[PDB]
Symmetry: C3
Subunit: 254 residues, 3 copies
């Protein structure tokens, strides 16, 4: 029997928003020490990896490994049904035909129980993360969100260029162009505005805006975003959770 | 001469919102002791009955019965023109070709006078309400609104099932399912959250969500909704006014 | 070299909103004492004239006259990229191939530099304004905005009728009609609510709502709108700036 109790349904809903507009069906491998889930879009240039530790729940019990694949188009609908700041409990019994989502609230007033029909999905799990990445920066997700949103106005292709102590986002379109530059700094008034950068080797990569716009969906999950870049491999965009994370692996072109 | 003065135009606009997305043209039978109006959608499974007593206005005068049929698509447009919290006065003279809607405000600053061309419409008024209904409950319109909106995500058909001291709204779709259960209780901290239920005989009816979504439009008119159910006849959904009401008669299928 | 520094980008963005949904490409004739710009829609019934004095900027330098034509569809996109309450600096060098838009903020945190490819556009500048107009009124832009928006619901044609101390906006549609009447008055509690009217000769003109709706876009630029009317020539709708203005010349039909 599985019983994973989110303190606030928002968390799970906001997590699903990460996968939503970029992948369809996802296997949520549940087990002893939490949940993990992976998915890849049709064109195989964006991979989303989720890990949720036990501490991210208020209560978590999984007697025995249970893999629950489900349609996120359909799951999300049920997430709409819930009350944003209400306790959500996932329930399942061995070899589920279905998973039960369970909303509660303050008073035993309205307690909604939904059920989602599950689906068999062949896995073939990937493990592409690398040991070392040529460059590794971290900035407020809100700032990174802005930069992408703005430069997306001009070009369908955003170039990220990193020399030492210099991160340059560039967009060049038929219709004009644009470029933001930021620098590392420790902000003691509020360290959550800080910009970090550990450049081992410089990088000059170009990603599709279509996907960078999907990646910034996770901005609702963490104050900061973790962007690891190397020129031979996909970039790691990571939003950290209380215990766990949401990772986006994006391959740049050319 | 007719002169019906709403204190706030919102009331009349919110009333029209009740008829709007479910019926088209409506005869507003005006007379001595107020206004009444009835309408039925194309498929004849939803009937809307309105009664507005004199006390619901701040000033009301109707010398002589005047039946004013009008296009609610067109009327609503004029209701858009008005200032939400402004006094609205309906004016008409014997055998109107048209009705005049009259907005005012605080200062004699802007005073807008609109006119709506009326239409001849054959009536055939219905009187289908019954003496006794097998079950009769009442709950906060906001709560009932939620229940319908949520379960509408999953199924195009919502089943309401009432045994003693047990009201169970159920939705079962191709894509999972859902079900809310509520109980009667007197809430003294705020009696407007109370749930009442007088079950003479149990009921197990299923209505189309399409229409239950239209019915919850009246949630802007009253804190509570009055749902009377019987298994042989259409359900009565009623939102009470200061003096009057807005009723929705809905036939369940099968 | 040109360097025009708006204190807040909003101003320039809100100015562009004036031209936006009514004209396409516009030549911004920049020179010593500021910027001016003119444009005419396809059907040539709406002409927009802008003047921005030096005092409207916080810093302005134009060594030498520079005419910069540009696509407002495309310019606006870049105006989306900026931070509403941030300093915006237009930069250009002799015979630009392009103009540079430059956002800043509080801290030297994010400083975005965009560039817009310019376009050659043949001018043929118009000077149609007249010495005297038969009638000249001024009212709160918010009020005038409302009047147009409301009466636009009913008719695609709005008639403005001015006799002495009487301004009557009228709309008459297939579906009913409407008419607002206002009077001149000095409001000492707040003179910005005042309504002025200097009628030399009466006027009875009818304009297309399509365009009056475009004209009220400038309501974001000034508290009041200046409407000058004469029966032989286009109406002057003018929203005043700190130093300058945004004018809309509209020809009435029949």
């Amino acid at each position: 029997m599985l019983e994973a109790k989110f303190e606030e349904a928002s968390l799970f809903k906001r997590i699903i928003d990460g996968f939503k507009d970029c992948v369809q069906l996802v296997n949520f491998q549940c087990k002893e020490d939490g949940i993990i889930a992976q998915a890849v879009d049709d064109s195989r240039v964006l991979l989303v990896s989720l890990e949720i530790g036990v501490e991210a729940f208020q209560e978590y019990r999984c007697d025995h490994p249970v893999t629950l694949g489900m349609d996120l188009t359909s799951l999300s609908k049920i997430l709409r049904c819930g009350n944003n700041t209400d306790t959500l409990t996932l329930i399942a019994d061995n070899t589920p035909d279905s998973i039960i989502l369970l909303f509660e609230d303050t008073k035993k007033d309205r307690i909604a129980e939904y059920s989602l029909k599950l689906m068999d999905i062949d896995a073939d799990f990937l493990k592409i993360e690398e040991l070392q990445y040529d460059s590794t920066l971290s900035l407020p997700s809100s700032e990174f969100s802005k930069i992408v949103r703005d430069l997306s106005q001009l070009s369908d292709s955003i170039n990220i260029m990193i020399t030492k102590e210099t991160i340059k986002f560039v967009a060049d379109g038929d219709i004009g162009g644009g470029s933001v530059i930021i620098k590392p700094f420790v902000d003691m008034e509020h360290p959550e505005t800080s910009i970090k950068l550990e450049m081992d080797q410089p990088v000059d990569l170009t990603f599709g805006a279509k996907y960078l716009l999907d990646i910034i969906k996770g901005s609702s999950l963490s104050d900061r975003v973790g962007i690891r870049l190397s020129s031979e491999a996909p970039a790691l965009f990571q939003f950290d959770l209380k215990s766990g994370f949401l990772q986006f692996f994006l391959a740049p072109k050319f």
